[PDB]
Each structure stands twice: as C-alpha cells, then as structure tokens.
C-alpha cells in the first residue's frame, strides 16, 4: 500500500570480487568501507540537486542463491525501497543475464539495475549486444557496463563509471526529498 522512500542503493558482488567492489565504492561513492555493511545518509549530489541515500553493501558465494532469497515475499519490502542495484562480477563466469528476467519481474518497476563486468577480456561489442537485449526490456533502467577504463564511445555516449554516475544522476528518486 504505502510506497516508502525509495533511497537504498545495493552494491553486491560474488565473493571473489569483494575487494574490487570495495575499490568501486571508493571510486563512485567516496566510501571507505571494510566489507558487508549499511552506510546511512550518504549524499548524492550533482549540479542540479542533492538527495540523501543509504548504501547497502552485500556479498554472496553464488549469485543465483542470493537472487532466490531476494525474490521471496519476505524481501518484498526491501525490494520496494531499492533506488538501484549494482552487481560487480565476472559476467562470463556468473552470467547474471540468465537470472535477469526473473529478477526484474520481482523488482520494483523504478529500480535501476547496473551489471558491472570486471572481466577484462570482454569487449564493448559483447556488452553492447547485452544492452540491446535488456536496456528496453522493462520499465527499469538496466545496463551492462565494463569497469577496468575508457569513459566514452565513438558516438559521444558515456561509458565506465562516468556512465554509472549518469544513470544515478538521471534516476527518479521516488518519494525522496530532493533539494536544489
């Protein structure tokens, strides 16, 4: 019934990429974490607005097992407060695209989902093909992004962390107080 302020961002990795996830948090959010934790009342600010959000940092041994738990009725309240979900993984190993249909069915329709690939052998053409499939599949902004990092393509679009920053900047923060 009630739509709670939707101001949580979950950053998840499978166990082998936990350290890279900690570096990602420093680079994008300027958050010096130690591991899995709840970091409250962070500020996301750009030239247009400021909004306050909570960072949820999690880890899992197996992505599908984590997805199964996330999709349950008991986790529905949690899903509904997610502004976004960022998964840091080797997409060749974990193939999160295989779980994405079922994951998105359960997700709140406004939640952004960014799948960050850290496997340096994956070229942008491979990412581009995944984005052609998923970027308009749902109401949600869904994007696969490589992170190693060139920050633009040949058509003047952003890539890398610059792109992820743009996705967060352009997000509609549902029932959050946004200040100029």
Curated annotation (Swiss-Prot):
Disruption phenotype: Displays increased levels of spontaneous RAD52 foci in proliferating diploid cells. GO terms for molecular function: protein-macromolecule adaptor activity. One of its GO terms (biological process) is vesicle-mediated transport. Keywords: Chromosomal rearrangement. Belongs to the IRC6 family. Involved in gross chromosomal rearrangements (GCRs) and telomere healing. This is Increased recombination centers protein 6. It comes from Saccharomyces cerevisiae (strain ATCC 204508 / S288c). The chain holds residues 2 to 185 of 237 of the full protein.
């Amino acid at each position: 019934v009630l739509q709670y302020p939707q101001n949580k961002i979950l950053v998840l990795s499978d166990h082998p990429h936990n350290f890279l996830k900690t570096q990602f948090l420093q680079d994008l959010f300027h958050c010096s974490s130690t591991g899995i934790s709840i970091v409250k009342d962070q500020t996301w600010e750009n030239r247009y607005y400021k909004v306050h959000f909570d960072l949820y940092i999690d880890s899992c041994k197996d992505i599908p097992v984590w997805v199964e738990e996330f999709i349950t009725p008991e986790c529905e309240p949690l899903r509904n407060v997610m502004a976004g979900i960022i998964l840091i993984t080797d997409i060749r190993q974990t193939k999160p695209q295989e779980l994405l249909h079922q994951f998105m069915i359960a997700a709140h329709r406004n939640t952004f989902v960014v799948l960050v690939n850290v496997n340096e052998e994956v070229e942008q053409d491979e990412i581009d093909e995944l984005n052609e499939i998923w970027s308009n599949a749902f109401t949600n902004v869904i994007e696969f992004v490589n992170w190693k990092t060139v920050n633009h393509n040949d058509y003047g679009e952003k890539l890398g962390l610059d792109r992820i920053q743009e996705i967060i900047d352009t997000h509609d923060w549902l029932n959050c107080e946004v200040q100029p």
